[PDB]
Design a protein around this ligand. Structure first.
Ligand SMILES: CC[C@H](C)[C@@H]1NC(=O)[C@@]2(NC1=O)OC[C@](C)(O)[C@@H]2O
Ligand SMILES: O=C(O)CCC(=O)C(=O)O
Ligand SMILES: [Cl-]
Ligand SMILES: [Cl-]
Ligand SMILES: [Fe+2]
Length: 282
């Protein structure tokens, strides 16, 4: 693909998300993807280094050892190191383990991104016309700080003859993606387009839970279809993912908002992730 998407750029300011104007904000939310300026005080260098190292094993300091932590170590099949069928290999960790398992500076990064994402999500919920007292249940806790949050590190193995990462929608409400190299593509309006590279911005997009939640609103919001093209050289990235609380045995559920009525349950949060990962990776 040779077309490059023209995305709207936003900033977090005194009143929440600031786009250039109300029309720009509407286009961004209608597309389900936009750029978000990275706060100047926020240090991403340890996260960038973790994404470059996590897969390399205990010979490589300080982060290569996370290659050896599989899902078995967490009692949760979703977490730890995972080789995917595509070029991608990942390390995924939910917030309840960050303080104990991640390096301290990586847990700190995760916490910063959680509070940034929280602020982004609340701006979106307000634009959707959902009553504020329904936000906590509608977002499975992400309208406050009680959601499930995964800080997930990605490395694309260019020696594998696969697509980088198959076409998919994310599971949750908000993904804050840190990417510094080409490869991410988005499908708005049934044409694949490259996401412009800008290491001064995150890429923000909505997941399936945002789409389900707002599907009956006057302006439904989409979970952007996106992929990573086959990489001829290595690539890395990381993202902060916000989902309805999906702990084993403590699942907040996924809801659709019915204007003038309230929230109706659609499915489980973990169930949605499992069904989505099935539909993606085959
Ligand atoms: C347990 C997953 C968690 C809810 C979150 N959501 C996701 O969609 C993602 N990663 C995450 O960290 O999992 C699958 C994926 C397409 O590779 C993407 O990277
Ligand atoms: O690496 C990227 O740019 C995208 C990663 C992604 O889409 C995901 O982890 O769900
Ligand atoms: Cl601010
Ligand atoms: Cl590329
Ligand atoms: Fe994604």
């Amino acid at each position: 693909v040779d077309r490059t998407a023209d995305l709207e750029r936003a900033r977090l300011g005194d009143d929440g998300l600031d786009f250039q104007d109300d029309a720009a904000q509407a286009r961004a939310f209608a597309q389900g993807v936009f750029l978000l300026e990275i706060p100047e005080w926020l240090d991403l260098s340890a996260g960038d280094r973790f994404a470059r190292q996590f897969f390399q094993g205990t010979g490589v300091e300080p982060y290569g050892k996370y290659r050896d932590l599989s899902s078995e170590h967490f009692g949760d099949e979703l977490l730890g190191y995972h080789s995917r069928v595509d070029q991608l290999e990942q390390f995924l960790l939910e917030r309840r383990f960050w303080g104990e398992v991640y390096p301290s500076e990586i847990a700190t990064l995760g916490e910063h991104l959680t509070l940034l994402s929280h602020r982004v999500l609340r701006s979106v919920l307000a634009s959707a016309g959902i009553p504020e007292e329904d936000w906590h249940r509608a977002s499975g806790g992400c309208s406050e700080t009680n959601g499930s949050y995964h800080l997930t590190f990605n490395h694309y193995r260019s020696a594998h003859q696969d697509i980088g990462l198959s076409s998919h929608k994310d599971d949750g409400f908000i993904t804050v993606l840190r990417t510094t190299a080409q490869g991410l593509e988005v499908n708005r309006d049934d044409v694949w387009e490259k996401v412009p590279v800008d290491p001064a911005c995150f890429v923000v997009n909505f997941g399936l839970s945002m789409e389900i939640l707002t599907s009956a609103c006057v302006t439904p919001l989409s979970a952007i279809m996106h992929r990573v093209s086959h990489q001829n050289f290595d690539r890395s990235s990381f993202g902060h993912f916000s989902s309805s609380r999906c702990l084993p045995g403590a699942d907040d559920g996924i809801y659709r908002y019915l204007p003038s009525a309230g929230l109706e349950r659609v499915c489980g949060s973990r169930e949605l992730i499992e069904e989505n990962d099935h539909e993606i990776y085959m």
